[PDB]
Ligand binder design. Sequence first.
Ligand SMILES: CN(C)c1ccc(C(=O)NCCCCCCC(=O)NO)cc1
Ligand SMILES: [K+]
Ligand SMILES: [K+]
Ligand SMILES: [Zn+2]
Length: 357
Amino acid sequence: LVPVYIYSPEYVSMCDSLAKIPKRASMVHSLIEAYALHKQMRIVKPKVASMEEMATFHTDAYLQHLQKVSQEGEYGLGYLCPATEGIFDYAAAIGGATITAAQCLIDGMCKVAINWSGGWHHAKKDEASGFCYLNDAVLGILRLRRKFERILYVDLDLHHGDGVEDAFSFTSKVMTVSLHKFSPGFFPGTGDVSDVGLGKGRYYSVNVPIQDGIQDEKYYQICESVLKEVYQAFNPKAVVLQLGADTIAGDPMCSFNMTPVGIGKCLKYILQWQLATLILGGGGYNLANTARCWTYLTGVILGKTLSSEIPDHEFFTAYGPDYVLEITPSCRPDRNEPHRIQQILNYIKGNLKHVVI
Ligand SMILES: CN(C)c1ccc(C(=O)NCCCCCCC(=O)NO)cc1
Ligand SMILES: [K+]
Ligand SMILES: [K+]
Ligand SMILES: [Zn+2]
């Protein structure tokens, strides 16, 4: 019935410590609360993932090493994933939160479960990557598999959801769809349209490479085109949706030129399928804009229209100088040639023809 909102004071305090997005969790929760949206959701405390729960995907060797280094502060713990004190605990908290959301969906407690602090899509079974030390999305998908036969993973973060795609590269039980920037030197470097999965999983991986400057209209046209085909061919029983906000105009990633409205249209399209849906966050480095985005998306989920004026709350000053919920696109050029986008969409349409349930 009402959406499940994964939250607890302890969980947010933990997430707030993440070095790349300091206090972002509190900002997001704070704005959602200022709009009184929590009163329309079922608040559920997340559990902490146990070593064995994390091991449903990650290797013991990796988890044991992560735990060891987290104690002092060849597993990818380099420049992007430094071994800081307590990182194992922060990771287990987020993995546990996504698993908890998955469990709520399986129990039929709700049709939609939200963990805005999740979405660490780059982590591999035995390697940390791109600020991600644990892949909570994979953990949630594996939990959902207990109830739902086919799971669709959709990743709208600016970056390719390589960790999730790789985890399920060889299977047809989980289809991964990622829309992302694909350019020379842009992390992680994978996900061209020709990347369709491997072996029994061939054609069960979908990738839409996009160039700088994409805006809401074209982005939704692409997303609707792909998801329509995906739904028809794959007939998913549940969905895990990653909504990293690093695609939003104003993000220091300076790549895409989206607004929450565009991402909201993609979300609505998925919500109309009326399937169990696990909602996750992800990237988003302009903190106030990420809070604006996810708060607006929470409103979309609840079917509510929010006031344009940012309500007074703990982080009010961060929304200056205009203090409004809407985000204005930049004047950066759209580098996406219509013909190339059309080619990409047709290539994908053709690939999905190979998918038959
Ligand atoms: C010259 N020098 C020392 C460097 C140059 C470039 C990078 C980099 O791109 N790093 C990758 C940035 C991480 C992208 C992950 C963001 C995200 O939200 N993923 O989902 C690093 C160092
Ligand atoms: K993506
Ligand atoms: K797959
Ligand atoms: Zn990202």
